[PDB]
Amino acid sequence: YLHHSRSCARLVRAIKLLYSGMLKYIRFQVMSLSPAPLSLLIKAAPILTEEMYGDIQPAAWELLLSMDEHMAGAAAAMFLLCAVKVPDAVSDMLMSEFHHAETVQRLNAVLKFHTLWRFRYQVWPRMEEGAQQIFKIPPPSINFTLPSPVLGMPSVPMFDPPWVPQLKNLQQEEEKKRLGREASLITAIPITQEACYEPQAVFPACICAAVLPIVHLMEDGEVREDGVAVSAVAQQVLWNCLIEDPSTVLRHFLEKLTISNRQDELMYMLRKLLLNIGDFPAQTSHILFNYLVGLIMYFVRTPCEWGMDAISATLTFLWEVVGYVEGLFFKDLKQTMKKEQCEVKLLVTASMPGTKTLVVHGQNECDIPTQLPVHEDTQFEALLKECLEFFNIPESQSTHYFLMDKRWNLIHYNKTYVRDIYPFRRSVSPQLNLVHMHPEKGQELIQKQVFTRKLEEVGRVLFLISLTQKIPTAHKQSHVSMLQEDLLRLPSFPRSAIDAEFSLFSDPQAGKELFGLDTLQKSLWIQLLEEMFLGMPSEFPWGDEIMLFLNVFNGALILHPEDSALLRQYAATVINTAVHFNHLFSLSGYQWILPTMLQVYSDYESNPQLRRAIEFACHQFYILHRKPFVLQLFASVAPLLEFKGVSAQCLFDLLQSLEGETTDILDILELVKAEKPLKSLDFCYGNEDLTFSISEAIKLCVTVVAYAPESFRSLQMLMVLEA
């Protein structure tokens, strides 16, 4: 075929040398002779039969890699028309080429895909002067809608573009321009698209579906004999496609979720693409974030069989996506989400009203429905009990009957609050069914749905963490203050961040998975609250409200004290808060934390690792605050002392661990943000007093009594001395 093209080019040159308007025809409508057949068939596309398309497909496929640009463009147009008309054959050919046993074949398949991508915009001009009225091409059927305002910045403008036309001051302006150019990435923008001065596109669903094999070939390390690897070509092609227009690249994948249950694979492929490319350009990240949020919104609004599962799957990845979106701010996020009535699903600080009532149907269709008023503290257990009493079920089948939602496929766990799941106060109350089920089947469904919901909550927390970490050095304090006030005004913040499914942990089936998710969620909540704390002013005027945020830490240490990861995360974050909020924790604060640590230390006496970690944390506390910390420790152990409760011997064990240096077995210090050789945060206590003698503790208690003998704190310290 290359010989044929060279022969045709030589004939064209000979004809040119033979010769007015004929030269114009030669240079404007011949331009070569090789594409004359293909460009003919493109002109007869409406009248081509399916057999003709199948027969022309292999030729147009092979001719895509021509040096001649006209031949390549005509072949691309013809193959795009074939994919429009015979998607099955085109898809089979694409899969055979992408999974071909020869390295050269796969590399050529990726290169041909790139040529198709280039000539995507040059199909209608080659087709016919009156087409696109005939030869109807199905438009991309978009099902969901993006958020009404775009969440992030559409793209980051390149600093000082060469294609945009515009002495200390001159020198500083030149330095500023140089720094801006060095800070702006030119490989992450469509260079030729933006450099052209100022038109539909043909790219059917099979050609878009070809991106998945290219994503997989991004990892295909097979090297051609010319030294070119398939992975490099695939990465370059996909990078250029995502740079130019990510919408067409991701159209197929985004539509497939609404089309069918394919979320567990869409998220897998998106994660694979992100990992192999290693980043996300601003436009790509913006588009992907908006489409994922719109998908969550769609599955919230349209009742679908796999809607909750798709929402969980997309929440498992939106946190990775959001780390690259540019110009996304928490206030705009809240505004758009509460405009869209979808804030609860991706913002862990939502604050929706509730339902205030709901209608529960009976098992029988002729049964008269019941209506239960919903209050803030009502859980589905009370509603189920009332429904069982109402619909005349004589306690013979009390575990057979489950509250269920049919519009949204939901079976309600008893210990879940009604307003958490039905948060909107719309005119129409939720409608439930008293579905009779075999108890094991009902419990299996409840376990599965609770696991999915917990994974959604994990994703929400991770999304918020990534959003906070993306925020620049400026706007950090504003964002943190917004988070703190949102948590405070949230009526169910500590309960949401601290609760657990104790009725579901005991099940030998699907019980341990929930426990693993719970440990992950508690660790994530600790990390999120530490992120909020570090970013607030160090001298923030606190009160009794700090407990509301510290109880979560304590909660995480009640459920999972023996988990080493959770234990060292707790110790690291408590040390970070003691260092950061130094003034608060030099007078108070330890009183919000120490009683829980003492209770855990006394409870798990048989666990030497937990006791060692608690003793190391207390040693670090004494290093930071020396005498105030000991006084707060005694004040927080005095109520717990007994003559269950913290014993009088475990307190002495903690003190004896304080006096002697303890090794860090769990590497707690490596997670401390201010990781230095820890010193006394007060200069007055600055001294080589690393040793905390028990005699010093006795002197401290004696002094607290001597200060005010009749104080209540005096009798607390007297009890501590007596112990």
């Binding site: 500590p494 601290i498 609760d499 104790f502 409200e545 407990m547 509301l548 109880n551 009640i558």
Partner: peptide, 15 residues
């Protein structure tokens, strides 16, 4: 955990 939750509820009620 229920004791912690009740303490939190009382704290919110007081505020």
């Amino acid at each position: 955990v229920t004791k912690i939750l009740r303490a939190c509820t009382r704290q919110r009620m007081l505020s």
